[PDB]
Amino acid sequence: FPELKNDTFLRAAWGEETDYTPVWCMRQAGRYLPEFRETRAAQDFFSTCRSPEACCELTLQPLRRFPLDAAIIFSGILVVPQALGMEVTMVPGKGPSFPEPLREEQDLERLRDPEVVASELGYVFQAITLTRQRLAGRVPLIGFAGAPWTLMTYMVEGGGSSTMAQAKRWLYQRPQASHQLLRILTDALVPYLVGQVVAGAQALQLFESHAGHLGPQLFNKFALPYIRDVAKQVKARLREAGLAPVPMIIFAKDGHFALEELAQAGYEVVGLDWTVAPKKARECVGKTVTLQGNLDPCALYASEEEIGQLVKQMLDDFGPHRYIANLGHGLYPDMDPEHVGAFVDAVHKHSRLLRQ
Amino acid sequence: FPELKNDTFLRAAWGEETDYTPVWCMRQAGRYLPEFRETRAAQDFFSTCRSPEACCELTLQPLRRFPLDAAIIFSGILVVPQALGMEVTMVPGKGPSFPEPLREEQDLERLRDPEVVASELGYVFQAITLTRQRLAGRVPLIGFAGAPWTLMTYMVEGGGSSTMAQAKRWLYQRPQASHQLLRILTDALVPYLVGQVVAGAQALQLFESHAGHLGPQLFNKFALPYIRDVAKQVKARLREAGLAPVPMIIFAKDGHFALEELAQAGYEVVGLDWTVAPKKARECVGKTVTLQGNLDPCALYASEEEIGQLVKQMLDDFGPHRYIANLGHGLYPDMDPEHVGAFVDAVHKHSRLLRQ
Ligand SMILES: Cc1c2[nH]c(c1CCC(=O)O)Cc1[nH]c(c(CCC(=O)O)c1C)Cc1[nH]c(c(CCC(=O)O)c1C)Cc1[nH]c(c(CCC(=O)O)c1C)C2
Ligand SMILES: Cc1c2[nH]c(c1CCC(=O)O)Cc1[nH]c(c(CCC(=O)O)c1C)Cc1[nH]c(c(CCC(=O)O)c1C)Cc1[nH]c(c(CCC(=O)O)c1C)C2
């Protein structure tokens, strides 16, 4: 692959001092871009995911607009449940659905052996290799997957939920089957994530988007062990294959309660939602790990001037070291690309002022 | 197995009233789908048939496109002659061939004992069980086989024929050897069909695709007895194994002349080609059996609007009761998937209008 030119994001991830704070945005390839909608209009979502050229194009679009310090491959977290043998649809304005969710223990029998999942996800690897070549070293490319608990929620609920009542009913009433499912997911995720690195990914983010529905007791029992196992095993396999392990990011949305434990889970970077005050997060995680985040995505509805001031304040609270700027969650479809631009420029401008 | 969610097809097959008319299409897994061609490009046809995952994928593809009321397992009718010990090929754009057809009585000696055939077809059972699990109760799964006479034609002719002159020359010149062959086929088919149900099939269709080459006299002598024996024996074996018998469909293409006899042959459903007027078929078969069919497959070359009107007329002629919609024969490779979609949507739309 082409040599990396701007490695600021990786240096920050590993905890090195940098000349400025690197920034990227969750869902930077997203509907808020008119060009994203145009490219997507051609296929259904999961078909787009299976076209390496379409994924590469969608990955590159935000970088043509903004000097983001990382690209993230266009894909979905739900490709893993799909590769395990569940049927998923992207519903006309209602989002992802599994019309046949897992509801009893016997339903686990219809899943693939997790050791075959990576082969089913070759298309993601193809997209990654293509995008890495086309980026030509501009910035690092981030690969990603959903975390075991969050993937379980989709598989059991059959889509989004305000309570996760069915998935939590599994944890309390079916603890053994729940552990079985979470282990299947873990065993699928590890080879998938390794394959993403083999294909060219230079960092990995694990999205535990549904962390917040669990308290600490359930999180520690059912989410945390598998978060830890993913990191441990991915790093092991990469080292054994003669490759360099990449920085890994754990993002537990609404996971305020788990920050101390997440800081000791084998990830270089802990990503934060906007509800956690940066200084409190720093106290929780300590001084080695890098923090990522955490601007309220809705802050981008504010004026460009206001966005710059909110960014200044955020950067003051995080301080210059061990920090990668991002939003607290992904961009929303009605946001103005110029305000995303304002966010990026502000992190760059203020982080430099903050150093000298 | 997962509990069946949409059982409309089975209710219709047994002759129960339903809220709408269920529909499926012969060759719904077929070349008209670009994704079918892609999946097939990897192997030769009979090798694809021997991969449970490939068969499951091909079975599911049409359901991802259209709300069909049944799935049919991807396989071939020629797996039975192959399992009996004949060598078959799928010729580069010339279709199935047996380079060493049966031509004299002594040639029967090279066939397996029909009681071992089911064991040779384990791969079909594996595909069925996998597909049943993966479908997760969305719709019922149909298993199938060729009828004895039609299988004989392939075995003697060595492929397709416009006249079946060699196979008919067997019936007239070699009646005893012909009965011997038809009995071998019957004795192979029964355990195969039972095994398909044991593996998860929820209905069975027997394809007498080559019925039309026979008149009534030859059909009644050489085809009908074995059609009857298949149904009787399959139901007996299932009951004796403690399983529930499934609805069975007999489809005699070009079999206008045999409809009265087919209605008394022990099948819940008589399938019709497009040449038989629905009202005349209803008169022939009487009021218990369910009819299946019968739109000219070539009608799908017409505009989506025209397809809807032809469907409306067809449904008017059949009436709402004791009817499963399908084409009169399988989809052709040059047909437009959107027109197949139009067919499905039209049956659903008009059948509901026809009830209330
Ligand atoms: C990383 C990523 C994701 N989605 C997409 C990407 C592409 C990478 C690029 O982001 O910029 C494209 C991606 N994926 C999807 C879309 C929108 C569909 C469309 O384009 O019409 C896009 C752009 C579909 C999708 N897929 C998902 C949802 C949310 C459902 C819910 O609210 O519960 C949705 C809406 C599941 C999903 N997908 C993702 C998450 C994690 C979000 C986070 O925690 O920050 C989740 C939970 C992550
Ligand atoms: C049920 C079924 C069949 N074929 C195939 C299936 C898979 C199930 C899914 O249909 O949708 C795949 C199936 N089987 C075959 C194909 C095409 C080969 C390819 O994919 O290149 C497919 C998709 C090969 C095949 N196999 C056969 C033919 C026809 C030969 C002739 O015209 O005499 C052909 C072309 C024999 C056959 N096969 C079948 C019949 C009955 C057709 C009917 O009466 O409606 C017959 C007569 C039935």
Swiss-Prot record, chains A, B:
| Listed name of the protein | Uroporphyrinogen decarboxylase
> Annotated Gene Ontology MF terms?
uroporphyrinogen decarboxylase activity
Residues annotated to bind coproporphyrinogen I: 27, 29, 31, 40, 76, 154, 209, 329
Question: What's the impact of mutating residue 160 to D?
Answer: In HEP; relative activity of 17% and 60% of wild-type towards uroporphyrinogen I and III respectively
Top EC group:
lyase
Q: What is the effect of changing residue 157 to K?
A: In HEP and FPCT; nearly normal activity
Q: Name one Pfam family in it.
A: URO-D
Give its localization: Cytoplasm, Cytosol
Q: Which family does it belong to?
A: Belongs to the uroporphyrinogen decarboxylase family.
Q: Gene encoding this polypeptide?
A: UROD
Q: Which UniProt keywords apply?
A: Acetylation, Cytoplasm, Decarboxylase, Disease variant, Heme biosynthesis, Lyase, Porphyrin biosynthesis
Q: How does it assemble?
A: Homodimer.
Entry EC no(s): 4.1.1.37
What's the catalysed reaction?
uroporphyrinogen III + 4 H(+) = coproporphyrinogen III + 4 CO2; uroporphyrinogen I + 4 H(+) = coproporphyrinogen I + 4 CO2
Origin: domain of life: Eukaryota
Q: Which GO terms describe its biological process?
A: heme A biosynthetic process; heme B biosynthetic process; heme biosynthetic process; heme O biosynthetic process; porphyrin-containing compound catabolic process; porphyrin-containing compound metabolic process; protoporphyrinogen IX biosynthetic process
Q: Where does coproporphyrinogen III bind?
A: 27, 29, 31, 76, 154, 209, 329
By its UniProt entry, which PROSITE patterns does this protein fall under? UROD_1, UROD_2
Write out the coiled-coil annotation as residue ranges: none
Task: Say what the protein does.
Answer: Catalyzes the sequential decarboxylation of the four acetate side chains of uroporphyrinogen to form coproporphyrinogen and participates in the fifth step in the heme biosynthetic pathway. Isomer I or isomer III of uroporphyrinogen may serve as substrate, but only coproporphyrinogen III can ultimately be converted to heme. In vitro also decarboxylates pentacarboxylate porphyrinogen I.
Q: What is the effect of changing residue 155 to R?
A: In FPCT; activity < 2%
Q: What is the effect of changing residue 134 to P?
A: In FPCT; decrease of activity
UniProt site (Transition state stabilizer) = 76
Q: What is its main location?
A: cytoplasm
Which NCBIfam families does the record match to this protein?
hemE
Q: How does activity depend on pH?
A: Optimum pH is 6.8.
Look up the record and name the pathway of this protein. Porphyrin-containing compound metabolism; protoporphyrin-IX biosynthesis; coproporphyrinogen-III from 5-aminolevulinate: step 4/4
Give the species.
Answer: Homo sapiens (Human)
